[PDB]
Design a protein around this ligand. Structure first.
Ligand SMILES: N[C@@H](C[C@@H](C/C=C/c1ccc(/N=N/c2ccccc2)cc1)C(=O)O)C(=O)O
Ligand SMILES: [Cl-]
Lengths: 256, 256
């Protein structure tokens, strides 16, 4: 029964500040899917924890000049947190430097856009330059296009790469706003798209999932929590609890 | 330098004997998704191997009286195999006794039924009695329904259980043939449903995934290969190689 430090990041509906008229204290300031998941994990494993929002505000990417990591990944590497419980994508490059639990949610990159247009796939966007499109700078989604040898997606990356300053945004809050107020398609993880489209009733996911990945709890390399967390996740999945938590948090405010 | 012993089991289209007019020897006698996966893994990690078909023809379950395991899971526990490369579901009870890689495929229980009807979900079946529905008796799909506390799945279990002589079958093939000839829906893994619907143009999956689980490569607890194989699988996913393999082994002769 250690007391752990858990790093996480603000992103609805995984983690948000709980609405209140007066200051809330400590872990009580937060709510969301990942907050509920962290509570269920602590019940099973028997630990208390302090939630600390990641200090530099980032998920985790590697500086290609100096090799250094940032974000929640770096916090784990440096043993500044015990666990990262967030919508943090399990990717090849990250799994090499930290230990992820098995996934608690499965998803893929897709496209956020306006409802009734001729666009129907990544190919449709890749073909033309008239409708702009991008992703959040330095997330797994942007990293995917940058590294992809796949035809359409190297082509999409050229468009993005040569327009880094315009089409790449700094957050999801900013991407969504750009979709809503300009002619722009936002490349984004499908779970987040599904939350957005149950709120902004004039937006939609375009096409299928472009790839496949999961979110996992991050731990430092070698951590004894990693396997215990994987086993607790499997228990919660088999009890129906992960599904119930997803329904709780994605229950859109009634989108006609 | 030591070759690995890989336990597996015959299961279409994951592992089958290859039909060929040309002489085949040893491992080359097998083909399938899991064989292609093993070959990619051995190229990436640089190991040689011998494929062996599991002695008791089982994936792996624990005896409810004496606590002993069988199947491929037992071969890993006893250190008789280094890897199990098969569509072995990553479950809580198994993950406690062996080390699974991360999933190479993610799936769930779903519903096989004919096209063209107003039936659109599990709930549509649950609240009627005209259309019969069932599953393989004593299979993982049945286990789910029996333990679920969800209202819809509870009704479904009560129906299937009480009507077991009428609606449960001994094999997927008996259930599929029944969907084709009679007013009957069949519950099984979505991977199997996809294989079927690619070959039976008059059939479809109804609704989405009822639960969520992954197939993973098994290794003995503590194996140094587990994390390596995880990292190779993530590389293959990101390169689009696992998607290409899935398409190769699942695609049928096309349907309008
Ligand atoms: N979930 C993905 C990240 C996800 C999208 C969002 C990435 C993102 C990256 C950095 C980020 N940073 N926000 C701040 C905010 C304030 C200060 C510094 C940074 C905000 C969002 C994606 O679709 O790629 C991952 O795990 O990398
Ligand atoms: Cl793992």
């Amino acid at each position: 029964n250690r007391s752990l430090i858990v790093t996480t990041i603000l992103e609805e509906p995984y983690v948000l500040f709980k609405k209140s008229d007066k200051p809330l204290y400590g872990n009580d300031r937060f709510e969301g899917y990942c907050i509920d998941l962290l509570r269920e994990l602590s019940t099973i494993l028997g630990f208390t924890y302090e939630i600390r929002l990641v200090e530099d505000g980032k998920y985790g990417a590697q500086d290609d000049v100096n090799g250094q990591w940032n974000g929640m990944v770096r916090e784990l590497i440096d043993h500044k947190a015990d666990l990262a419980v967030a919508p943090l994508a399990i990717t090849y490059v990250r799994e090499k430097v930290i230990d992820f639990s098995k996934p608690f949610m499965t998803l893929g990159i897709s496209i956020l856009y306006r409802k009734g247009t001729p666009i129907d796939s990544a190919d449709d966007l890749a073909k033309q330059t008239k409708i702009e499109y991008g992703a959040v700078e330095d997330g797994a989604t942007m990293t995917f296009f940058k590294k992809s040898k796949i035809s359409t997606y190297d082509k999409m990356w050229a468009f993005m790469s040569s327009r880094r300053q315009s089409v790449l945004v700094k957050s999801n809050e900013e991407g969504i706003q750009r979709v809503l107020t300009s002619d722009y398609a936002f490349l984004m993880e499908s779970t987040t798209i599904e939350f957005v489209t149950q709120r902004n009733c004039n937006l939609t996911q375009i096409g299928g999932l472009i790839d496949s990945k999961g979110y996992g709890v991050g731990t430092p390399m070698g951590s004894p929590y990693r396997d215990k967390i994987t086993i607790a996740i499997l228990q919660l999945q088999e009890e129906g609890k992960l599904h119930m938590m997803k329904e709780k948090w994605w229950r859109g405010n009634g989108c006609p």
